[PDB]
Amino acid sequence: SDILPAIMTPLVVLIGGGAAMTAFFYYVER
Amino acid sequence: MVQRGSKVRILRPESYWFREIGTVASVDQSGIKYPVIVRFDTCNYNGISGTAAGINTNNFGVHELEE
Amino acid sequence: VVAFGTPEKQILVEPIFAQWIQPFMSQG
Amino acid sequence: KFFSTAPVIALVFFTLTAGFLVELNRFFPDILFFP
Amino acid sequence: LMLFINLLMVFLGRYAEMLATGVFAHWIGAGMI
Amino acid sequence: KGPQTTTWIWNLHALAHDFDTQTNDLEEISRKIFSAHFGHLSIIFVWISGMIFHAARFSNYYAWLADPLGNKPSAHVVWPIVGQDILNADVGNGFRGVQITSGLFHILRGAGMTDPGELYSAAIGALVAAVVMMYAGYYHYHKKAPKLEWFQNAESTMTHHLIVLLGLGNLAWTGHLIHVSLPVNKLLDSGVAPQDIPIPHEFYSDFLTFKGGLDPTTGGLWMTDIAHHHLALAVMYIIAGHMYRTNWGIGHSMKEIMESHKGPFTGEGHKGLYEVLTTSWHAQLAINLATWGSFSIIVAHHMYAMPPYPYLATDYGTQLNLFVHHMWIGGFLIVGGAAHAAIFMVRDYDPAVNQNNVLDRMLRHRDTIISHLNWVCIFLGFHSFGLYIHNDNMRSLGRPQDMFSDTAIQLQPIFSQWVQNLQANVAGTIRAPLAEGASSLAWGGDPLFVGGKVAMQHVSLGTADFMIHHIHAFQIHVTVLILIKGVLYARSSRLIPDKANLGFRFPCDGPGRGGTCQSSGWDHIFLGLFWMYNCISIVNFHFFWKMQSDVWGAANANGGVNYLTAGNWAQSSITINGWLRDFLWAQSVQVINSYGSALSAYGILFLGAHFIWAFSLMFLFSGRGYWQELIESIVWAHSKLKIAPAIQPRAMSITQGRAVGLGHYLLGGIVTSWSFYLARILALG
Amino acid sequence: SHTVKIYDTCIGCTQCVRACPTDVLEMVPWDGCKAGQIASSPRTEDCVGCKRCETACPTDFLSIRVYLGAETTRSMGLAY
Amino acid sequence: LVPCSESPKFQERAAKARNTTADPNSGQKRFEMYSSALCGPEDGLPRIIAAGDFLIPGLFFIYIAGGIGNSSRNYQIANRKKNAKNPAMGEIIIDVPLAVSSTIAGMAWPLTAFRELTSGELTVPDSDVTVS
Amino acid sequence: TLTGQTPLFGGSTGGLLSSAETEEKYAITWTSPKQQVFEMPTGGAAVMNEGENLLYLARKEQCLALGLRQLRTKKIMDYKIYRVLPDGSNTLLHPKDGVFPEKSNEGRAAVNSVARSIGENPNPGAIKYTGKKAYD
Amino acid sequence: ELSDLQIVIALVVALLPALLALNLGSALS
Amino acid sequence: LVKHGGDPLVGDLATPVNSSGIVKAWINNLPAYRKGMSANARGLEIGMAHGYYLYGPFATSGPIRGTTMSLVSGVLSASAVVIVLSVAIQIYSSVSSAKPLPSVTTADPGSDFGTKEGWSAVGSGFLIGGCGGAVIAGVLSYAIAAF
Ligand code: CL7
Ligand code: CL7
Ligand code: CL7
Ligand SMILES: C=Cc1c(C)c2cc3nc(c4c5[nH]c(cc6nc(cc1[nH]2)C(C)=C6CC)c(C)c5C(=O)[C@@H]4C(=O)OC)[C@@H](CCC(=O)OC/C=C(\C)CCC[C@H](C)CCC[C@H](C)CCCC(C)C)[C@@H]3C
Ligand SMILES: CCCCCCCCCCCCCCCC(=O)OC[C@H](COP(=O)(O)OC[C@@H](O)CO)OC(=O)CCCCCCCCCCCCCCC
Ligand SMILES: CC1=C(C/C=C(\C)CCC[C@H](C)CCC[C@H](C)CCCC(C)C)C(=O)c2ccccc2C1=O
Ligand code: SF4
Ligand code: SF4
């Protein structure tokens, strides 16, 4: 779990930020 | 409170001239809620931005006015 | 005055009450 | 009339006050504190 | 010289004020020289 | 009528020169305007007299004229009262005075004025020119108001102002040059002492060449080339002025030419423009200020690249001061041009007159223009400033190989580099032929050295120069976007269809429609001035840093130049940290360390300018509201004490708050840069 | 939309109604004041909120007061 | 903190001094004058302590400030008594006779202050003071 | 059905956008004495044809700006403003009574007239959690 | 010095407030 | 070629740029507008074109450029961008009601954009096309380099 940074960071920033932005988009556009 | 001339201190809280002496210039009209028409020396803020002059005379309430 | 090269002429006011009260560093 | 008008009146007054203070400073040296 | 005279004669053609036509021809001569 | 509110005073000063407002008839207006133009010319004559007078009376002019390299021009002695004596500098040969940067001395030497008598004569000449120009105004207004017809006579006025002034002024000046200036400068170069040189009353390939480049002694252009140039222009302008129709059958009528020019795309073409131009002062002031500003900017570039006057090149202080002064005047004038184009569009625009002409067609596609400018500004924004950001990130991330630079990823300004090769190598026998050399060394040159100093050299162009050029393109387009938007939407928008009616200056049309603050054409000039400031600030910085890293310097033992900043432009100007560190931080060392020296005044003005600038944020960031509330509390405190003034004190107009915000922002920012430049170049250069 | 409320002290100068750029205001007959009129605001779905009305009103504590809320296409002043 | 005479730094500053006024002796005169005041040992720069230092020039300042304030107040009274409409050519245009009278009655404010304080002439009643 | 002749205009970009179709246009119809030239509020100069002229604009303020500033100046006070829905519902708005709102006419109620003057409006502290506004 | 067992347990614990934050957020909406 | 206004009250000027024949030909036959395409087809062509284009900036300009791995960057980057656009289409369509309106350039836009069905179809197209585009461009880059 030295690599956990290289997984957690893209997951949270890119994937989570993406999913968050998508969800907030649905939320404010529905 | 005389129509030709007077010294009324306005007690209307929402007024530019609250607590200022003013000279009435019109007879209190029958059936007019605010018929004093006191003329105050100082001008009001009235006017578009950078309008120098404003309003000198407003139809003040009789109750609000006081000799 | 400092620019004109006469720092003497500065209005240096000493903080007397700070001296009176004075962890505490020199109040000039 | 021109004399009465603020700009000229003030121009003269301050060109006097400024010159007066300049003259004072010219004559008396740097006075930081009352001697 | 002939060239300058030729230009003045042609300048009348251009016009078709006399001073103006001549002036133009003079400059054309200056260019040719 | 009466001064009831403090706003009256402000309004007085504001609309005092708004002849359009005060008057109703173009006649009375044009009379006022003509009279004023005289007044103004007198102000300029006073000022010119002042400059040549100070050069005569309080100057090291004669010493400088003797030995320019040694001496530093200083026609500005300061009275010692509060210890400001220190502002008087050791400029050499023991003269103590404020080192002037106007280049007045270079002007006079170029004019071939060597005699103190001559200089006093010039001073008094210009001063009587002032005394007559102000009276001429009085005469032409009070005594004898001119006639509307004369004004509308644009064809006459063109022919006149183009031969009488341009053609004849250039011939006149070439006389004054070849006869007085050119031989005097020849003698002074040969080494004839100022005293030795004869007074003026005492009294073709030799004096007219196409050498190009610079006089290697003086560092200026060969005054032979100057004479030949001015003569050329005299010739051209005499002809060109003959190509109009004044009070005869000979020439082109402007209205004929204009109405001729139509086309597929431009519908009815220029039909109606002569009418609006003649009837509308503002239209004229717009076109003029736009071209006048544009002229000052060409001045700036030309005077640095082809330093006309003798020894100017070597005088780095003047070369900078003049580029920067002219850039400022340029930007300010260009914006006033836009201003008066908007004032025209609001006041002096008739839909009657303009009907499917080029102006109407502009207004009719004004969304495509604003939209496209918007786009080109975003585009350029990103592909100029965003390239610096890119580089800040890459360089800070230690990925210099990923940067835009002469190294790594390279954006070579090839069009410009090409034009440069095409002007350096293409000396003779192309288009206009028989040019012995390049018009300037800027195109391509080995450094010409006058004394230790590099007079002028190849101003290179790399990635740094591509980038900063796109920064200029970006900021000029944004300034155009703001200005052209304020012009084309001064009449109306989708937001406020009756803007024409609301006026040119109005604070807003109130809080509705989401808010309409700053929707007026005036408000567009407000915002345009901040972008013109940002634009010209970066142009002046680009100049300062490029000059002092790549052009200016000192010749050491080896051929190499000792550039003022040692060529850090190429690598340091391609990041914002580059600019903060290697330009503002690195180069503010003179102005910040200037206290207790000759340049202390630049230090003080650096601080005071920072203060005026910050202070303007008070005006720009706040609204009339808060201030009138606070003002009335303060008035209550004067009322308690019976000090309350006759003129009720009113928080300044919304528009005035903005105008002083902007005034202080501009004064502060400009003076700040001015302090920094002067301290650095007076000290170092 | 913006609620436009006309208060007791309306001196029926007809200044507001001539100001309103979306003609929200109609000068209606009223026995309350010497003027014989008052200001009415039927068409407040067309109130942009410019407050040119308030700006034009000459009475101290102006009777015409516009209260901005629930911005719509017509309030927000959108062509689009 | 220590007399400037005593402080060795101040003597160093005195040796090399910048002359403000044209006269060569202005620098030396200034330092000689400044010798009286107390100055910090490291700095050797005259300091100001909150009577000669601050109180006396404070008094002079206050006298002049009171003078100019009083003169303005007096001229305001002259404005509201000269004409039915005070502002028009009363503030924008300055009546030199009224002003000079106001100035002459100015600088007498210290004696005048006692009378003004008596019966609260200066203060106007809260009731009168216009405040929304 | 709100029929007039469209003022001779070369076209602009200042006109109706998708909202014209999607939501609601407006239409100003006025009677012109002459074929005179007027500033188009969209930006430009159009020439009103002789007699009834119909103009489809994008908001009421655009219509009332043509009317109040330009037409009324030309002394043309015949203009009628119609909210046009997509279905073609043309609804007269501006002179709803047929008389300019400045002139007092009967059968027009006092709308949003408030008895109490500005001064006397209630403080919000008092009315907290009632859901009544000060002006209300 | 911190072992993988520990890093995992920390994550698994942190997952609990995650679920409960989702729950509380939902509630407060 | 002159500027004229179809329906002069609408804010749309016919110009040589929006109403010319050559232009109308090109625009109206691009896969957004081209008549007689399944929405899926519209998307597959738009996608392929963009994926293929997108490969280039990424492969050429990115951080690992020059290396062999740059081709893989190019393809994955372009595909990532296409996946993000695929998300954008889905969420757009989810919340979109609006239909492409007839314009000067395109008198009959169509329904493929303007119905939730259409956008889903287009997006499925766009995704497959885009990632295909990007892969094809990398394959061709490797091919041409080798050859
Ligand atoms: C800033 C760009 C600008 C320029 C360069 C410019 N104008 Mg205009 N300009 C005029 C003419 C004009 C001329 C002849 C002219 C010549 O070049 C210019 N302008 C130029 C008059 C027709 C007309 C009125 C002229 C009139 O208002 O001008 C009177 C002067 C004013 C108020 C004083 C304030 C000027 C600066 C604050 C002072 C700067 C001095 C110094 C740098 C810093 C201070 C030094 C120190 C004290 C610290 C005018 C308009 C106006 C505006 C505006 C915004 C402008 N302008 C703008 C400009 C109207 O509102 C206004 C108008 O209402 O629209 C019609
Ligand atoms: C976030 C901070 C940042 C900024 C502001 C920034 N970069 Mg960088 N940035 C780049 C440019 C760039 C530009 C032009 C730019 C301008 O704003 C910026 N950046 C800005 C490239 C050099 C590089 C490449 C990134 C990369 O390649 O991104 C993809 C680029 C693409 C998809 C856009 C290409 C745009 C089209 C060509 C437009 C053409 C339109 C056409 C005309 C229309 C008509 C078509 C038809 C009808 C005819 C990049 C980097 C990179 C990074 C990183 C981290 C950054 N950056 C960072 C930043 C790389 O690693 C990476 C690094 O490797 O650097 C080498
Ligand atoms: C928000 C509703 C939603 C859910 C619940 C969901 N997806 Mg998708 N989803 C995928 C996986 C997936 C998994 C494994 C999964 C559940 O385990 C889900 N999804 C679930 C990938 C195969 C595929 C591409 C990769 C994909 O987008 O992310 C990979 C999936 C992850 C790590 C598992 C987490 C589950 C998330 C809730 C899905 C996140 C989708 C989000 C909207 C976009 C985030 C940013 C994005 C640009 C990466 C995908 C699609 C995609 C979309 C969209 C709009 C969605 N989704 C939406 C959702 C693409 O267009 C997009 C599209 O390309 O496909 C048509
Ligand atoms: C640093 C100060 C500042 C910035 C950054 C700024 C930014 C800009 N101003 C613009 C305009 C204006 N500004 C105006 C008034 C002002 N603008 C001011 C100060 C600024 N204005 C001030 C102080 C004023 C008051 C006078 C006006 C009146 C206009 C315009 O009309 C003009 C405009 O809008 O034109 C369209 C835009 C220029 C066109 C453009 O888009 O370029 C591109 C964007 C740039 C250069 C900003 C930085 C972009 C960088 C490269 C970031 C890249 C993006 C990354 C991906 C970061 C995203 C991070 C997320 C992932 C979290 C741009 C948004
Ligand atoms: C150094 C860099 C430049 C710094 C200054 C730049 C300022 C630019 C700000 C924009 C102004 C453009 C022109 C607008 C001109 C204009 O009309 O502005 C309009 C502005 C406000 O007009 P309003 O619309 O608010 O007034 C309303 C009335 O017109 C009716 O409502 O007026 C003022 O700013 C009032 C103050 C005038 C000036 C007050 C100072 C008086 C002394 C000035 C002395 C100057 C000496 C100069 C000597 C050379
Ligand atoms: C500070 C500020 C004010 C207040 C500033 C004012 C009222 C400046 C006017 C007062 C100055 C001090 C003018 C000088 C007044 C007289 C000339 C007084 C005589 C001075 C003698 C002593 C010489 C505004 O009015 C304002 C309006 C809109 C946006 C921002 C602001 C803003 O920021
Ligand atoms: S609120 Fe004002 S403008 Fe409106 S009717 Fe009353 S007095 Fe007239
Ligand atoms: S806010 Fe403006 S549009 Fe709305 S009612 Fe008042 S004056 Fe009329």
PDB file of N, CA, C and O in Angstrom, chain I residues 1 11 15 17 19 33 44 50 53 59 65 76 91 94 99 104 110 121 126 128-129 131 133 136, unseen atoms left out:
ATOM      1  N   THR I   1     -56.113  39.541 -37.047  1.00  0.00           N
ATOM      2  CA  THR I   1     -55.058  38.652 -36.465  1.00  0.00           C
ATOM      3  C   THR I   1     -53.695  39.348 -36.548  1.00  0.00           C
ATOM      4  O   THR I   1     -52.723  38.713 -37.009  1.00  0.00           O
ATOM      5  N   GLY I  11     -32.174  43.647 -42.166  1.00  0.00           N
ATOM      6  CA  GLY I  11     -31.851  42.564 -41.235  1.00  0.00           C
ATOM      7  C   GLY I  11     -30.675  42.945 -40.375  1.00  0.00           C
ATOM      8  O   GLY I  11     -29.817  43.744 -40.785  1.00  0.00           O
ATOM      9  N   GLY I  15     -32.043  40.906 -33.542  1.00  0.00           N
ATOM     10  CA  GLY I  15     -33.442  40.483 -33.578  1.00  0.00           C
ATOM     11  C   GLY I  15     -33.769  39.355 -32.629  1.00  0.00           C
ATOM     12  O   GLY I  15     -33.065  39.102 -31.631  1.00  0.00           O
ATOM     13  N   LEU I  17     -34.311  35.695 -31.092  1.00  0.00           N
ATOM     14  CA  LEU I  17     -33.437  34.501 -31.008  1.00  0.00           C
ATOM     15  C   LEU I  17     -34.356  33.292 -30.827  1.00  0.00           C
ATOM     16  O   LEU I  17     -35.535  33.412 -31.179  1.00  0.00           O
ATOM     17  N   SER I  19     -35.724  32.001 -28.226  1.00  0.00           N
ATOM     18  CA  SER I  19     -36.838  32.349 -27.307  1.00  0.00           C
ATOM     19  C   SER I  19     -38.031  32.944 -28.067  1.00  0.00           C
ATOM     20  O   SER I  19     -39.163  32.744 -27.603  1.00  0.00           O
ATOM     21  N   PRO I  33     -47.961  58.222 -40.942  1.00  0.00           N
ATOM     22  CA  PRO I  33     -48.268  59.187 -42.001  1.00  0.00           C
ATOM     23  C   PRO I  33     -47.385  59.051 -43.255  1.00  0.00           C
ATOM     24  O   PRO I  33     -47.912  58.961 -44.352  1.00  0.00           O
ATOM     25  N   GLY I  44     -29.669  49.582 -35.854  1.00  0.00           N
ATOM     26  CA  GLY I  44     -29.790  49.848 -37.292  1.00  0.00           C
ATOM     27  C   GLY I  44     -30.800  50.941 -37.549  1.00  0.00           C
ATOM     28  O   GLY I  44     -31.361  51.525 -36.591  1.00  0.00           O
ATOM     29  N   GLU I  50     -45.581  53.488 -45.521  1.00  0.00           N
ATOM     30  CA  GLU I  50     -46.844  54.265 -45.413  1.00  0.00           C
ATOM     31  C   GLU I  50     -47.939  53.375 -44.810  1.00  0.00           C
ATOM     32  O   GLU I  50     -48.151  52.243 -45.303  1.00  0.00           O
ATOM     33  N   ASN I  53     -47.801  49.579 -39.891  1.00  0.00           N
ATOM     34  CA  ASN I  53     -46.508  48.848 -39.859  1.00  0.00           C
ATOM     35  C   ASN I  53     -46.510  47.908 -38.656  1.00  0.00           C
ATOM     36  O   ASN I  53     -46.896  48.342 -37.561  1.00  0.00           O
ATOM     37  N   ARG I  59     -38.590  41.563 -26.686  1.00  0.00           N
ATOM     38  CA  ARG I  59     -39.168  41.854 -25.361  1.00  0.00           C
ATOM     39  C   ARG I  59     -39.987  43.141 -25.375  1.00  0.00           C
ATOM     40  O   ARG I  59     -39.814  44.016 -26.241  1.00  0.00           O
ATOM     41  N   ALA I  65     -39.784  50.884 -26.260  1.00  0.00           N
ATOM     42  CA  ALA I  65     -38.682  51.843 -26.438  1.00  0.00           C
ATOM     43  C   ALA I  65     -38.870  52.439 -27.816  1.00  0.00           C
ATOM     44  O   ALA I  65     -38.773  53.673 -27.953  1.00  0.00           O
ATOM     45  N   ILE I  76     -46.508  59.842 -33.659  1.00  0.00           N
ATOM     46  CA  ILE I  76     -47.300  58.625 -33.969  1.00  0.00           C
ATOM     47  C   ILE I  76     -47.675  57.982 -32.637  1.00  0.00           C
ATOM     48  O   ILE I  76     -46.831  57.299 -32.037  1.00  0.00           O
ATOM     49  N   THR I  91     -51.959  39.228 -27.854  1.00  0.00           N
ATOM     50  CA  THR I  91     -52.629  39.845 -26.689  1.00  0.00           C
ATOM     51  C   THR I  91     -52.172  41.291 -26.569  1.00  0.00           C
ATOM     52  O   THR I  91     -50.999  41.519 -26.237  1.00  0.00           O
ATOM     53  N   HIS I  94     -50.039  47.173 -24.012  1.00  0.00           N
ATOM     54  CA  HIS I  94     -49.637  48.504 -23.495  1.00  0.00           C
ATOM     55  C   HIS I  94     -50.857  49.399 -23.311  1.00  0.00           C
ATOM     56  O   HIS I  94     -51.199  49.744 -22.177  1.00  0.00           O
ATOM     57  N   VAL I  99     -56.038  53.697 -23.744  1.00  0.00           N
ATOM     58  CA  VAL I  99     -55.564  55.051 -23.352  1.00  0.00           C
ATOM     59  C   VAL I  99     -54.228  54.900 -22.634  1.00  0.00           C
ATOM     60  O   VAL I  99     -54.085  53.999 -21.777  1.00  0.00           O
ATOM     61  N   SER I 104     -55.318  59.220 -16.553  1.00  0.00           N
ATOM     62  CA  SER I 104     -56.245  58.463 -15.676  1.00  0.00           C
ATOM     63  C   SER I 104     -57.548  58.151 -16.416  1.00  0.00           C
ATOM     64  O   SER I 104     -58.163  59.075 -16.986  1.00  0.00           O
ATOM     65  N   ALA I 110     -57.139  50.518  -8.774  1.00  0.00           N
ATOM     66  CA  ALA I 110     -55.865  50.735  -8.057  1.00  0.00           C
ATOM     67  C   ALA I 110     -55.279  49.363  -7.707  1.00  0.00           C
ATOM     68  O   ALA I 110     -55.905  48.613  -6.930  1.00  0.00           O
ATOM     69  N   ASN I 121     -44.427  51.210   7.577  1.00  0.00           N
ATOM     70  CA  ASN I 121     -44.287  49.773   7.230  1.00  0.00           C
ATOM     71  C   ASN I 121     -43.743  48.993   8.423  1.00  0.00           C
ATOM     72  O   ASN I 121     -42.859  49.466   9.135  1.00  0.00           O
ATOM     73  N   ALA I 126     -40.885  41.794  14.003  1.00  0.00           N
ATOM     74  CA  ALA I 126     -42.262  41.538  14.479  1.00  0.00           C
ATOM     75  C   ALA I 126     -42.855  40.341  13.729  1.00  0.00           C
ATOM     76  O   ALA I 126     -43.374  39.415  14.389  1.00  0.00           O
ATOM     77  N   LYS I 128     -41.543  38.007  11.916  1.00  0.00           N
ATOM     78  CA  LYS I 128     -40.661  36.827  11.710  1.00  0.00           C
ATOM     79  C   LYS I 128     -41.479  35.524  11.800  1.00  0.00           C
ATOM     80  O   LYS I 128     -42.155  35.299  12.824  1.00  0.00           O
ATOM     81  N   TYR I 129     -41.408  34.706  10.744  1.00  0.00           N
ATOM     82  CA  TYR I 129     -42.004  33.346  10.622  1.00  0.00           C
ATOM     83  C   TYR I 129     -43.513  33.409  10.369  1.00  0.00           C
ATOM     84  O   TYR I 129     -44.172  32.355  10.454  1.00  0.00           O
ATOM     85  N   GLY I 131     -44.539  34.843   7.350  1.00  0.00           N
ATOM     86  CA  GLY I 131     -44.501  34.724   5.880  1.00  0.00           C
ATOM     87  C   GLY I 131     -45.125  35.933   5.206  1.00  0.00           C
ATOM     88  O   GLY I 131     -45.442  35.854   4.006  1.00  0.00           O
ATOM     89  N   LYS I 133     -44.529  39.917   4.100  1.00  0.00           N
ATOM     90  CA  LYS I 133     -43.461  40.922   3.880  1.00  0.00           C
ATOM     91  C   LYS I 133     -43.879  42.279   4.450  1.00  0.00           C
ATOM     92  O   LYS I 133     -45.069  42.487   4.734  1.00  0.00           O
ATOM     93  N   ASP I 136     -46.222  44.053   2.358  1.00  0.00           N
ATOM     94  CA  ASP I 136     -47.461  43.237   2.304  1.00  0.00           C
ATOM     95  C   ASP I 136     -48.106  43.213   3.692  1.00  0.00           C
TER      96      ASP I 136
END
